[PDB]
Amino acid sequence: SNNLDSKVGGNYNYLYRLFRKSNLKPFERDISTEIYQAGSTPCNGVEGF
Amino acid sequence: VFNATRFASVYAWNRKRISNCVADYSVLYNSASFSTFKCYGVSPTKLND
């Protein structure tokens, strides 16, 4: 759909889920935006290391 | 590799070969020291398996 939804300056309206706590189940949908913890520390709030 | 007193200049980036050894991450990945540690085709948790 290059000529129907791709922008010269970049179309950034489309998102994929790069991080999640676990392997997602068949036909299940994940709306969450909770910050993923890659480090061993807990990570409260909007951002962290 | 990681705790050298001086590193190379990037115009002269060194190449250290590694062999006949065990690659334990437990004092590397679990540390706070690395500001960005990313593996692009394997999970960092699986580097022991």
Curated annotation (Swiss-Prot), chain A:
Start and end residues of each stretch annotated as Receptor-binding motif: 1-49
Effect of mutating F19L: In strain: Omicron/EG.5.1
Domain of life (superkingdom): Viruses
Impact when changing L15R: In strain: Delta/B.1.617.2, Epsilon/B.1.427/B.1.429, Kappa/B.1.617.1, Lambda/C.37, 19B/501Y, Omicron/BA.4, Omicron/BA.5, Omicron/BQ.1.1; Contributes to cellular immunity evasion and increases infectivity
Effect annotated for changing V46A: Increased resistance to neutralizing antibodies
Annotated region (Immunodominant HLA epitope recognized by the CD8+), positions in chain: 11-19
Region spans: Disordered: 18-49
Function: Attaches the virion to the cell membrane by interacting with host receptor, initiating the infection. The major receptor is host ACE2. When S2/S2' has been cleaved, binding to the receptor triggers direct fusion at the cell membrane. When S2/S2' has not been cleaved, binding to the receptor results in internalization of the virus by endocytosis using host TFRC and GRM2 and leading to fusion of the virion membrane with the host endosomal membrane. Alternatively, may use NRP1/NRP2 and integrin as entry receptors.
Record note on quaternary structure: Binds to host ACE2. RBD also interacts with the N-linked glycan on 'Asn-90' of ACE2. Cleavage of S generates a polybasic C-terminal sequence on S1 that binds to host Neuropilin-1 (NRP1) and Neuropilin-2 (NRP2) receptors. Interacts with host integrin alpha-5/beta-1 (ITGA5:ITGB1) and with ACE2 in complex with integrin alpha-5/beta-1 (ITGA5:ITGB1). May interact via cytoplasmic c-terminus with M protein. May interact (via N-terminus) with host bilirubin and biliverdin, thereby preventing antibody binding to the SARS-CoV-2 spike NTD via an allosteric mechanism.
Name used for this protein in its record: Spike protein S1
Species of origin: Severe acute respiratory syndrome coronavirus 2 (2019-nCoV)
Taxon lineage: Viruses, Riboviria, Orthornavirae, Pisuviricota, Pisoniviricetes
First-to-last residue of the parent protein present: 438 to 486 of 1273
